[PDB]
Amino acid sequence: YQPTPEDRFTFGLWTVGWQGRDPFGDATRRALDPVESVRRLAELGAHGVTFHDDDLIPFGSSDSEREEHVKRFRQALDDTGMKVPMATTNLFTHPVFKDGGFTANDRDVRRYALRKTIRNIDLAVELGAETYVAWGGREGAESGGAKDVRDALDRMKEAFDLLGEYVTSQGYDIRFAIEPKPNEPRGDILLPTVGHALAFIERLERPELYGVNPEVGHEQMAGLNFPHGIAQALWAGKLFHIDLNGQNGIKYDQDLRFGAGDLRAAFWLVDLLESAGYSGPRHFDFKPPRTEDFDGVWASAAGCMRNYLILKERAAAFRADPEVQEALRASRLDELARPTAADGLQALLDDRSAFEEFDVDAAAARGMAFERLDQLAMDHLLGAR
Ligand SMILES: [Mg+2]
Ligand SMILES: [Mg+2]
Ligand code: NA
């Protein structure tokens, strides 16, 4: 289960670089130089890295310092063959963003947030990124009167529309991906789930430029089924990027390594991504726990990729097994894929077998055979076939 760059595994600089500061504790690890992270991740078999502006260029850097930070990073990419498929903006750490970036009540903060974002879009394009992520972690509220949500959505739309005008005007081949999260650090965050983000995109001026960047743990913070949400995003043609990690239920955002947390949900996710032919990066947004030293950081990162590869093997074996294919037919998955009424509305209305002469009791007595199917899936996941 050895990863290679062809597997398209990517990591944020802020993941392996997380120093371990949590709400109740100081950092347990020293800061990593981005150049070291690129080299170490390349040695593990990663394909690329991603960054927030402020991960790569310290906030407040002069133009000359900015140039030197980028030059050093580009040489590390050249030395390793690592790519940068995605970039994003930090609109959450600095105190100026305490009430949001794009939806801050203060208008001057909203304008600054847009300018900070635009500057990093230029850099992302320079480095070859194809997707630009926006996680609106400060967009929201702790109390009901603090934020008129209709006005906030107007401001959010305004911001994204302006960004779309900018990339179109410059001729950039980049697309945007909105990352939902239901809460934390705000009491409630705007666009809290994949569904809300997909709905919002349809009201933008150029919806084709925007998709979603769902994160395993974030949907699980609302108790939702992550594979189901991914299926809806794929169905809409909007899965532009994905963040892979683990989460143990409804609590603070844990960002565990992928495969930890809900293991069976991870299996069904990999099955879906591979079956659907998702071709984007397999990006890990995770935090090595603060109990770990640097050897544990790299072990945790390697484990992300290993677990994806094991699950990919098991899901492929499941789908290829003739006994599973028979069980899928026994459960009528084949019929689910056939149209209900390709004969059309009038034919349906005239079809006595659909109502007047339908034997509801005979249909009700048919078992779905779902438990046998699910036990075959369990056996395959555990390698007990
Ligand atoms: Mg998270
Ligand atoms: Mg994320
Ligand atoms: Na737009």
UniProtKB/Swiss-Prot annotation:
Top-rank EC class of the record's enzyme: isomerase
Any Pfam family: AP_endonuc_2
GO molecular function: identical protein binding; magnesium ion binding; xylose isomerase activity
Gene Ontology biological process terms, A to Z: D-xylose metabolic process
Highest rank taxon of the organism: Bacteria
Residues the entry annotates as binding Mg(2+) 2: 215, 218, 253, 255
Keywords on record: Carbohydrate metabolism, Cytoplasm, Isomerase, Magnesium, Metal-binding, Xylose metabolism
Main location: cytoplasm
Co-factor: note: Binds 2 magnesium ions per subunit.
Subunit structure: Homotetramer.
HAMAP family the UniProt entry points to: Xylose_isom_A (MF_00455)
Name of protein: Xylose isomerase
Organism listed in the record: Streptomyces rubiginosus
Name of the coding gene: xylA
